[PDB]
């Protein structure tokens, strides 16, 4: 797609700290951009929609190539349309925003310039942020994560994409998502099937795969840390059910691991660690700091800070594994005890290290789940299982929770706030901000 | 040996903090005891010495058994004889103390009661302490380390030792030291050879081996972190040159690894990290905090704090290894690049994990080196090598430094102060003291 300018595009600024082994941190100035899927897509020459509700214009978009030629992405009114605001080092995303139309959530990328994404090399480094999850009930996910996207959003590879990172193009993740409207500078109208339960979305014939580091998928009830390897590290198109992932009839046929090696303290047995109020180690009614360390071995370490008190990731015992580090032994024990082979089939932490050794783009999002109602994060899943099935229970939310239309109606003012991002060598991010 | 009471034995008190995963720390009250080798050893029935200068009474001690029957260890005047003092959570050790006689340094163990050593299970935990090394020049070593000693100092196994932990019996380490005067409830007079350069010491026919975790061997110039595995984890007697270690003609014949997998940031190439004054990352003219984390994988992580600024162990590149974690890959790369097979021959970090999974006793000492002048810690070693030999240079001290008689004459008021010991689960020791 190209870019149009019937609505101006001004990325909300966001600062963050880059820290050094020598003990100082210095402020960096970036901004955030909303993903292309949230945007108005219209004809280059008029205000006629190329995509409307959950279907495409059959005349503007008779095939993927003609559609991309005929159509552009336009600018975003971040606060009034999307409920996205920033102030200094803080970003807030509202759940439901009512303007001329209803908008649900947002997916945002950190920019290095008006036209390029910021790339972070995670290996050997740590990433710290503060989060307020107090306004996130069952069924919602405020997510902070990394994906192996191109810095230009795909422009250099696919010259029919001239919109680029400035318009939030080029997304990929470990689900090989097929709900994207443009992939590789072409539309995704071929094979499009409108969602049966979502007025605004559908599933197309192609998907967009890449490595995904889920630092944070969470609400006030549950939180998870999950690496997802793929056999191709960076962004790559896939076709139909060969994509695998959430959007395909077959979840596992493809190049990415859509399950990951997840660490959810509640799932692992510590049901007292994270939740609302003072009965929990970390009280989710209050802001908390989350620090994630990517050691050169490929293992991942985690600690939290709240009210100046530090907590390592809680210890877990699973099969022969005992510890608090997300390493080969954990991931192997997890597959053995909870089931599955997707993570190992895709090369596990060894393959994942290829992603963290390269650049990844920072994503911050707020979403509800039209496929599984977020039950995999905060409930019992699948819902017929009980607590006697190892790993079935992931949080205390009812298996009836998270119906999108219900949570959108009952909790439209839900929100997440991410702030005080700091990044640098392991051991450096707790030093004074600059 | 038995215990006598011509001089009273009052262990200087020392407090330390035990911290919990839940974020609180509580004060523990212990004390310190001086190692038996520093004590007066005399006949049970009189004040006649069993050991004097560097030789034994040939009448009281004609063989190891008769000697142990005839002889006792007596009490220690900690400050006036040994220059050992405590105050709250702080312990100081002076280098040379002049009383009726000259004393050099001390080796001390943390006690749980008047009659038992405190045992620490390191695996899954971290150990934090503060240290002032400002008064330690080239050739000296203020050491804080752990060894796999019995809690009773050997009494239960060797009933002819009735003195016990109260009199600092039962030492062992990864050198299988043969300078000990009593081992396994018998003297070490059989095969005794007085040191050619030390008026107070010698080498006997038996030695005392066990696993050794050198958290801290250091002065104002250099510091090293070193695990030493043994094929028998706990205390075990050895015979003659079969002992191996520093005290034997053959260094490597035995059950322990006397070299270890050492991590010295200077040796690894960062000559700016640790030293006196503001040209160094850590300024050794000032107190610093040293934190050492024993992850369940068997790897060891390290960070430092000075003036509220945190520094991870600096990154090192050695062969194919890159990182700041002391792990299997580091130790293997170290042997490949610097030479040697002792660490791996004895089972490496896997074998070492058997020590940290069990109890170990905390040792704090101050010493000069009558065998190699501490050159292995702070100089170029061996001394014919140059900086073109990988790993030869370990600090900036001259290869002429550390002659014991010289440093004892020039720097008798050298001292080390260890303080604010805190111990608990990984991630817990930076929380408020109780
Ligand atoms: O001037 C008017 C334009 O502003 C208006 O633009 C519309 C803005 O909203 C667009 O709908 C978005 C589409 O994305 C939805 O989010 C989905 C959530 O799940 C994700 O998996 C999925 O990928 C996302 O697509 C979002 O909730 C919703 O608001 C709409 O399509 C635009 O047309 O158009 C009319 C102009 O007059
Ligand atoms: O009442 C008098 C007693 O106090 C006096 O006791 C003497 C106290 O000093 C003893 O000499 C010690 C022996 O250990 C030396 O340290 C060595 C350092 O290197 C280590 O490897 C080695 O293992 C240690 O042994 C220490 O510097 C030195 O002071 C002496 O043997 C006692 O006799 O005895 C006379 C009474 O009248
Ligand atoms: O691991 C989770 C999964 O691979 C990703 O698809 C997930 C990460 O949070 O991404 C969200 O997918 C749904 C979409 O609505 C939202 O914008 C994404 O952040
Ligand atoms: O790793 C070093 C070696 O294995 C140990 O012998 C060393 C640890 O610092 O121990 C010292 O050995 C010499 C003695 O004079 C001193 O008391 C010990 O702490
Ligand atoms: C030494 O280590 C410190 C702390 O990691 C680092 O800041 C410094 O750049 C390093 N210097 C060299 C020369 O490697
Ligand atoms: C949960 O984790 C916290 C922090 O490590 C710990 O203090 C607490 O004892 C754990 N509780 C349970 C039930 O495992
Ligand atoms: Co590790």
PDB file of N, CA, C and O and ligand atoms in Angstrom, chain A residues 38 106-107 141 143 145 171 173-175 179 212 214 217 228 247 258 363 365-368 376, ligand 3:
ATOM      1  N   UNK A  38      -5.179  -1.103  12.063  1.00  0.00           N
ATOM      2  CA  UNK A  38      -6.124  -0.206  12.742  1.00  0.00           C
ATOM      3  C   UNK A  38      -6.552   0.988  11.888  1.00  0.00           C
ATOM      4  O   UNK A  38      -7.519   1.687  12.235  1.00  0.00           O
ATOM      5  N   UNK A 106      -5.291  -1.345  20.546  1.00  0.00           N
ATOM      6  CA  UNK A 106      -4.265  -0.816  19.654  1.00  0.00           C
ATOM      7  C   UNK A 106      -3.072  -1.741  19.717  1.00  0.00           C
ATOM      8  O   UNK A 106      -2.885  -2.425  20.712  1.00  0.00           O
ATOM      9  N   UNK A 107      -2.265  -1.727  18.662  1.00  0.00           N
ATOM     10  CA  UNK A 107      -0.951  -2.382  18.654  1.00  0.00           C
ATOM     11  C   UNK A 107       0.008  -1.326  18.140  1.00  0.00           C
ATOM     12  O   UNK A 107      -0.228  -0.732  17.081  1.00  0.00           O
ATOM     13  N   UNK A 141      -5.605  -8.334  27.729  1.00  0.00           N
ATOM     14  CA  UNK A 141      -4.149  -8.544  27.680  1.00  0.00           C
ATOM     15  C   UNK A 141      -3.479  -7.218  27.334  1.00  0.00           C
ATOM     16  O   UNK A 141      -3.668  -6.696  26.238  1.00  0.00           O
ATOM     17  N   UNK A 143       0.038  -6.099  26.525  1.00  0.00           N
ATOM     18  CA  UNK A 143       1.224  -6.846  26.136  1.00  0.00           C
ATOM     19  C   UNK A 143       2.388  -5.950  25.759  1.00  0.00           C
ATOM     20  O   UNK A 143       2.212  -4.918  25.105  1.00  0.00           O
ATOM     21  N   UNK A 145       6.128  -6.756  24.059  1.00  0.00           N
ATOM     22  CA  UNK A 145       6.858  -7.864  23.451  1.00  0.00           C
ATOM     23  C   UNK A 145       7.711  -7.422  22.287  1.00  0.00           C
ATOM     24  O   UNK A 145       7.643  -6.270  21.881  1.00  0.00           O
ATOM     25  N   UNK A 171       4.204  -5.893  10.157  1.00  0.00           N
ATOM     26  CA  UNK A 171       4.076  -6.756  11.323  1.00  0.00           C
ATOM     27  C   UNK A 171       4.194  -8.237  10.974  1.00  0.00           C
ATOM     28  O   UNK A 171       3.820  -8.686   9.869  1.00  0.00           O
ATOM     29  N   UNK A 173       4.434 -12.089  13.628  1.00  0.00           N
ATOM     30  CA  UNK A 173       4.675 -12.691  14.927  1.00  0.00           C
ATOM     31  C   UNK A 173       4.594 -14.205  14.814  1.00  0.00           C
ATOM     32  O   UNK A 173       4.455 -14.752  13.701  1.00  0.00           O
ATOM     33  N   UNK A 174       4.697 -14.880  15.944  1.00  0.00           N
ATOM     34  CA  UNK A 174       4.834 -16.333  15.912  1.00  0.00           C
ATOM     35  C   UNK A 174       3.522 -17.080  15.649  1.00  0.00           C
ATOM     36  O   UNK A 174       3.529 -18.318  15.532  1.00  0.00           O
ATOM     37  N   UNK A 175       2.412 -16.350  15.537  1.00  0.00           N
ATOM     38  CA  UNK A 175       1.138 -16.945  15.090  1.00  0.00           C
ATOM     39  C   UNK A 175       1.034 -16.943  13.570  1.00  0.00           C
ATOM     40  O   UNK A 175       0.045 -17.460  13.025  1.00  0.00           O
ATOM     41  N   UNK A 179      -4.785 -12.269   9.749  1.00  0.00           N
ATOM     42  CA  UNK A 179      -5.763 -11.157   9.820  1.00  0.00           C
ATOM     43  C   UNK A 179      -5.215  -9.834   9.279  1.00  0.00           C
ATOM     44  O   UNK A 179      -5.951  -8.870   9.139  1.00  0.00           O
ATOM     45  N   UNK A 212       9.188 -14.269  18.021  1.00  0.00           N
ATOM     46  CA  UNK A 212       8.434 -13.430  18.950  1.00  0.00           C
ATOM     47  C   UNK A 212       8.924 -13.656  20.370  1.00  0.00           C
ATOM     48  O   UNK A 212       8.918 -14.793  20.858  1.00  0.00           O
ATOM     49  N   UNK A 214       7.737 -12.762  23.913  1.00  0.00           N
ATOM     50  CA  UNK A 214       6.702 -12.175  24.771  1.00  0.00           C
ATOM     51  C   UNK A 214       7.225 -11.917  26.155  1.00  0.00           C
ATOM     52  O   UNK A 214       7.159 -12.779  27.045  1.00  0.00           O
ATOM     53  N   UNK A 217       2.726 -10.661  28.767  1.00  0.00           N
ATOM     54  CA  UNK A 217       1.321 -10.777  28.369  1.00  0.00           C
ATOM     55  C   UNK A 217       0.605 -10.939  29.682  1.00  0.00           C
ATOM     56  O   UNK A 217       0.937 -11.836  30.458  1.00  0.00           O
ATOM     57  N   UNK A 228       9.080 -17.537  21.531  1.00  0.00           N
ATOM     58  CA  UNK A 228       8.533 -18.343  20.431  1.00  0.00           C
ATOM     59  C   UNK A 228       9.523 -18.339  19.280  1.00  0.00           C
ATOM     60  O   UNK A 228       9.654 -17.325  18.560  1.00  0.00           O
ATOM     61  N   UNK A 247      -4.767 -18.473  13.479  1.00  0.00           N
ATOM     62  CA  UNK A 247      -5.646 -18.080  12.373  1.00  0.00           C
ATOM     63  C   UNK A 247      -5.858 -19.203  11.347  1.00  0.00           C
ATOM     64  O   UNK A 247      -6.603 -19.017  10.379  1.00  0.00           O
ATOM     65  N   UNK A 258       3.644 -21.510  17.757  1.00  0.00           N
ATOM     66  CA  UNK A 258       2.638 -20.584  18.267  1.00  0.00           C
ATOM     67  C   UNK A 258       2.377 -20.764  19.772  1.00  0.00           C
ATOM     68  O   UNK A 258       1.624 -20.004  20.337  1.00  0.00           O
ATOM     69  N   UNK A 363       6.943  -3.871  20.656  1.00  0.00           N
ATOM     70  CA  UNK A 363       5.496  -3.793  20.444  1.00  0.00           C
ATOM     71  C   UNK A 363       4.843  -3.629  21.820  1.00  0.00           C
ATOM     72  O   UNK A 363       5.236  -4.296  22.805  1.00  0.00           O
ATOM     73  N   UNK A 365       0.755  -3.364  23.218  1.00  0.00           N
ATOM     74  CA  UNK A 365      -0.610  -3.528  22.718  1.00  0.00           C
ATOM     75  C   UNK A 365      -1.595  -3.746  23.846  1.00  0.00           C
ATOM     76  O   UNK A 365      -1.207  -4.027  24.992  1.00  0.00           O
ATOM     77  N   UNK A 366      -2.873  -3.565  23.516  1.00  0.00           N
ATOM     78  CA  UNK A 366      -3.966  -3.898  24.407  1.00  0.00           C
ATOM     79  C   UNK A 366      -5.033  -4.556  23.552  1.00  0.00           C
ATOM     80  O   UNK A 366      -5.471  -3.981  22.547  1.00  0.00           O
ATOM     81  N   UNK A 367      -5.443  -5.760  23.951  1.00  0.00           N
ATOM     82  CA  UNK A 367      -6.384  -6.547  23.166  1.00  0.00           C
ATOM     83  C   UNK A 367      -7.283  -7.464  23.990  1.00  0.00           C
ATOM     84  O   UNK A 367      -6.945  -7.836  25.115  1.00  0.00           O
ATOM     85  N   UNK A 368      -8.437  -7.791  23.412  1.00  0.00           N
ATOM     86  CA  UNK A 368      -9.231  -8.950  23.868  1.00  0.00           C
ATOM     87  C   UNK A 368      -9.135 -10.022  22.792  1.00  0.00           C
ATOM     88  O   UNK A 368      -8.616  -9.770  21.703  1.00  0.00           O
ATOM     89  N   UNK A 376      -6.357 -19.049  27.925  1.00  0.00           N
ATOM     90  CA  UNK A 376      -5.011 -19.622  27.967  1.00  0.00           C
ATOM     91  C   UNK A 376      -4.085 -18.831  28.912  1.00  0.00           C
ATOM     92  O   UNK A 376      -3.093 -19.379  29.404  1.00  0.00           O
TER      93      UNK A 376
HETATM   94  O1  LIG C   3       2.183 -14.982  21.936  1.00  0.00           O
HETATM   95  C1  LIG C   3       1.148 -14.450  21.618  1.00  0.00           C
HETATM   96  C2  LIG C   3       0.837 -14.363  20.148  1.00  0.00           C
HETATM   97  O2  LIG C   3       1.897 -15.035  19.471  1.00  0.00           O
HETATM   98  C3  LIG C   3       0.741 -12.939  19.598  1.00  0.00           C
HETATM   99  O3  LIG C   3      -0.170 -13.107  18.511  1.00  0.00           O
HETATM  100  C4  LIG C   3       0.195 -11.867  20.561  1.00  0.00           C
HETATM  101  C5  LIG C   3       1.203 -11.292  21.553  1.00  0.00           C
HETATM  102  O4  LIG C   3       0.517 -10.548  22.594  1.00  0.00           O
HETATM  103  O5  LIG C   3      -0.312 -10.767  19.799  1.00  0.00           O
HETATM  104  C6  LIG C   3      -1.482 -10.142  19.832  1.00  0.00           C
HETATM  105  O6  LIG C   3      -2.283 -10.885  18.899  1.00  0.00           O
HETATM  106  C7  LIG C   3      -3.645 -10.440  18.836  1.00  0.00           C
HETATM  107  C8  LIG C   3      -3.755  -8.958  18.481  1.00  0.00           C
HETATM  108  O7  LIG C   3      -5.101  -8.556  18.753  1.00  0.00           O
HETATM  109  C9  LIG C   3      -2.815  -8.101  19.319  1.00  0.00           C
HETATM  110  O8  LIG C   3      -2.694  -6.807  18.755  1.00  0.00           O
HETATM  111  C10 LIG C   3      -1.414  -8.684  19.382  1.00  0.00           C
HETATM  112  O9  LIG C   3      -0.640  -7.878  20.276  1.00  0.00           O
END
